[PDB]
């Protein structure tokens, strides 16, 4: 719609971190991440770093953390909401077993085609089923067709941030009991810690208010036990109880 | 020498944080941690905050993360090194199923007796086998007694930091293949990002060097996959590959 420019350069929080020191984040990346990063994940990240929406790319240290979660819970069927160029999608496909399956949903396949060559040369494209659509209509039709023995083990939510609460009401019925739902950016550059934060782009302000509402909602939801982790831009792990 | 003894006020780092703000950290605790904290964990934490070594108490948001890791990986048998007043121990005991068993090792049981009444009221003391000893002799004795059916699914290391690398050589044999080892304080108040740090206590400088060596070691160890997480004072998750 008509209005103000909503490009990445129009944003205010691009360079703000939740860690105190930029040295500390670089230490973690140089010491414990880059020596453990797949060669194709490195290539996908370096291309994405130059993209016009580079701020949406998931942090590399967080990627190695999501891979650890998938392996420890022995996930085999997962769903990803928000693919972009596919860093977390490639991370997920590399962690799953050979017969693992992923449902990847994004409104823009042009983003996904940027990282598709890296995914292919990693040899894990066969696990991925890409759905070019809005995520909410896909999840609602899944509610129509999913049987209990088809429920997902793991779900990464990283698409349109104000819609997390809407995705939640579907994913607690699409993920198995004891499965995991992870919401990304739940600390939003640290702006959620304050009732008001001046000088944000209108869309950044919408995310701050929506994340402050989601965090209260997740902490009070009896269907789930939560864990908010201050890695990357912050994430909340959600385990379905019933 | 003789006098008043070791204080946590002799240390230079106890007031430091890795997050950008104390408001952000207190937001995480007030929003997502305290409403989910067990009543006995709250009582244990509040008494421990007045102890003379309250700096070593595991952060409450990290406790929920460890509880989440135990359930997602379906842990049943764990080992804890460094108990103190038992916050992480009580966190672990509440997370495990009713038939879970924990081997808790600490050189000082007087610390543990501070938290024992809270563990009893929670009704989980039957899962805990406390051993008052130095950790290394106990771990070595386990290696000659351990059968494959007795391997641990999970190990939390949070004792004397300079001994982590020595604990690592034992724990990759005591933890089952696919099991997890978590090393606490691997970021050490952010000092690991600096080759030199001024004004540190001799024991504080010793662990900054130790953790700079351990983080390089763990990132190069081909026996495990790793994931360093910037929660609390930073931790490193290790998953055994063979
Ligand atoms: N309504 C919607 N439904 C599905 N996807 C959407 C959406 N709105 C935005 N998106 C997509 O969600 C993505 C978020 S960027 C996600 C980053 C990626 N997961 C990573 O690991 O780096 C964008 O590519 C955007 O195209
Ligand atoms: N060599 C050693 N072997 C076993 N325990 C040790 C040790 N050196 C120190 N410790 C113990 O390890 C503890 C570290 S503080 C640990 C904090 C605790 N895990 C928590 O949840 O808060 C101290 O209580 C100390 O008594
Ligand atoms: Mg993100
Ligand atoms: Mg600690």
DSSP code of A127? G
Token code pair at residue B106: 């600490």
A33 CB neighbours in chain B (<8 A) are: 228
Secondary structure E strands in chain B: 77-81, 101-106, 128-132, 152-157, 175-184, 224-229, 235-240
**Method used to solve the structure:** X-ray
- Nearest ligand to the CA of B156 is 2
- Does A135 show up as a binding residue in the annotation? yes
CB proximity B238 to A under 8 Å: no
Q: Is A139 in the pocket of ligand 1 (CB under 6 A)?
A: no
Q: Do B231 and A230 touch (CB under 8 A)?
A: yes
- Does B153 show up as a binding residue in the annotation? no
Q: A2: distance to nearest CA of chain B, Å?
A: 35
CB proximity B192 to A under 8 Å: yes
Q: A60: distance to nearest CA of chain B, Å?
A: 11
Contact B164, B181 (CB under 8 A): no
Token code pair at residue B132: 């008052």
Q: Identify which of A44, A241, A218, A81 has the alpha carbon closest to the alpha carbon of residue A161.
A: A81
Give the domain ranges of chain A: 22-240
Calpha distance B190→B207 (Å, rounded): 12
Calpha distance A13→A84 (Å, rounded): 19
Calpha distance B41→B115 (Å, rounded): 9
Q: Do B21 and A193 touch (CB under 8 A)?
A: yes
Helix (H) or strand (E) holding A172: helix A164-174
Nearest CA to ligand 2 atom 1: B134
Q: Is A130 in the pocket of ligand 1 (CB under 6 A)?
A: no
Calpha distance B185→A65 (Å, rounded): 17
- The SS3 assignment for A238 reads strand
Q: Kindly report the backbone phi and psi dihedral angles of residue A5, in degrees, each rounded to the nearest multiple of 5, phi listed first.
A: -65, 130
Cβ neighbour number for residue A197 with a 10 Å cutoff: 18
CATH of B17-240, one of 1.10.1740.10, 2.40.50.220, 3.40.50.150, 3.90.480.20: 3.40.50.150
Q: Do B19 and A61 touch (CB under 8 A)?
A: no
Contact B223, B242 (CB under 8 A): yes
Token code pair at residue A173: 């019925």
Cβ neighbour number for residue A41 with a 10 Å cutoff: 24
Q: Do A190 and B20 touch (CB under 8 A)?
A: yes
CB proximity A150 to B under 8 Å: no
CATH superfamily of this structure's domain A22-240: Vaccinia Virus protein VP39 (3.40.50.150)
- The SS3 assignment for B79 reads strand
- Does A134 show up as a binding residue in the annotation? yes
DSSP code string of B116-169: HHHHHHHT-GGGEEEEES-HHHHHHHHHHH--GGG-EEEEEE-S-GGGHHHHHH
Q: Is A108 in the pocket of ligand 1 (CB under 6 A)?
A: yes
């Amino acid at each position: 719609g008509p209005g103000m420019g909503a490009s990445q350069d129009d944003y205010a929080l691009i360079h703000k971190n939740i860690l105190h020191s930029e040295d500390l984040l670089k230490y973690i990346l140089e010491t414990s991440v880059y020596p453990r990063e797949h060669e194709q994940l490195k290539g996908l990240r370096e291309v994405t770093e130059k993209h016009e929406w580079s701020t949406a790319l998931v942090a590399a240290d967080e990627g190695l953390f999501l891979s650890m979660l998938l392996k420890l819970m022995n996930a085999k069927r997962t769903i990803e909401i928000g693919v972009y160029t596919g860093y977390s999608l490639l991370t997920t496909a590399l962690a799953l077993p050979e017969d693992g399956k992923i449902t990847a949903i994004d409104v823009n396949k042009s983003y996904f085609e940027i990282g598709l060559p890296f995914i292919q040369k990693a040899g894990v494209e066969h696990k991925i089923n890409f759905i070019e659509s809005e995520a909410l209509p896909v999840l609602d039709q899944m509610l129509q067709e999913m049987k209990e023995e088809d429920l997902y083990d793991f779900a990464f939510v990283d698409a349109d941030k104000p819609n997390y609460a809407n995705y939640h009401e579907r994913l607690v019925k699409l993920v198995r009991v004891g499965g995991a739902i992870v919401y990304d950016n739940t600390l939003w550059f640290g702006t959620v810690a304050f009732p008001e934060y001046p000088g944000l782009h209108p869309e950044e302000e919408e995310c701050r208010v929506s994340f402050r509402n989601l965090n209260k909602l997740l902490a009070a939801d009896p269907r789930v036990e939560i864990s908010q982790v201050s890695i990357g831009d912050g994430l909340t792990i959600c385990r379905r109880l019933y």
